[PDB]
Amino acid sequence: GKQHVKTKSDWVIQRTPVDPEWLKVYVDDESKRLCLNFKDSFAPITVEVKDIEKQIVFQSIIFPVAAGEYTLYLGDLSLGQYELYMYNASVKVVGNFTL
Amino acid sequence: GKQHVKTKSDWVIQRTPVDPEWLKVYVDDESKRLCLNFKDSFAPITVEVKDIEKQIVFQSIIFPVAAGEYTLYLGDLSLGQYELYMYNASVKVVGNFTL
């Protein structure tokens, strides 16, 4: 029948310096796209974009199941200054950009 | 055009103890199933099972895109004693079980 397997977890990330370039984010202000390039796969991460009046104007969850480029579509946004906030249990990422 | 957005990452996980029950592993020796229950979503993780001669008898990548239970079928395996090893860039997990 069904039995618990006693496991031990070694969180190597807690003793391993992280690559400053694990994530590279770009904005294309012509096509109104955000491009997120992950060097390795990663846990799902929530992406929020906030305007100058603190309105959340875009929210999505990205599933980086493989290394490579993930695109987010910001076509519905006005021009202006935006804050990018990405988060999950492991990391919080902040940046700013203009459309 | 396309412009780099400077981002600052805060790796919360590097300074935060992780719930020892983040992952619960079970084995059903009748159905020859391994069951992996994640409390939260997680990065893709490689699952390897080794026999007493250290032959790798099962190897697969799991994609824990949502919290919940993931099942792996071990029908190819003999009755016997096995070592479990699961790993990605962030964690290594070890346990042992019987079929």
Domain boundaries, chain A: 1-99
DSSP helix/strand/coil, B44: coil
Instruction: Please tell me the experimental approach by which this structure was elucidated.
Output: X-ray
Q: Do B95 and A8 touch (CB under 8 A)?
A: yes
Q: Which CATH architecture has domain A1-99?
A: Sandwich (2.60)
| Pairwise CB contact (< 8 Å): A5 & B30 | no
How far apart are the C-alpha atoms of B62 and A1, rounded to whole Å? 23
In terms of Cα–Cα distance, which of B94, B41, B82, B84 is closest to B63?
B41
CA distance readout (Å), B44 to A30, A38, A97, B47, B73: 33, 13, 30, 10, 18
* CA-based nearest residue in chain B for residue A10: B92
Q: In chain A, which residues have their Cβ closer than 8 Å to the Cβ of B94?
A: 7-8, 10
Q: A99: distance to nearest CA of chain B, Å?
A: 10
Token pair of B60, please?
């697969």
Strands (E), B1-99: 2-5, 7-10, 23-28, 33-38, 45-50, 56-62, 68-73, 81-87, 92-98
**Residues in chain B whose C lies over 2.5 Å from the next residue's N (breaks after):** none
Q: Which amino acid is at A71?
A: T
Please work out, in degrees rounded to the nearest 5, the angle formed at the alpha carbon of residue B11 by the alpha carbons of A51 and A81.
Answer: 15
DSSP 8-state assignment for residue B6: P
- From A51's Cα to the closest Cα of chain B, the distance in A is 16
Alpha carbons A42 and A63: distance in angstroms, whole number: 8
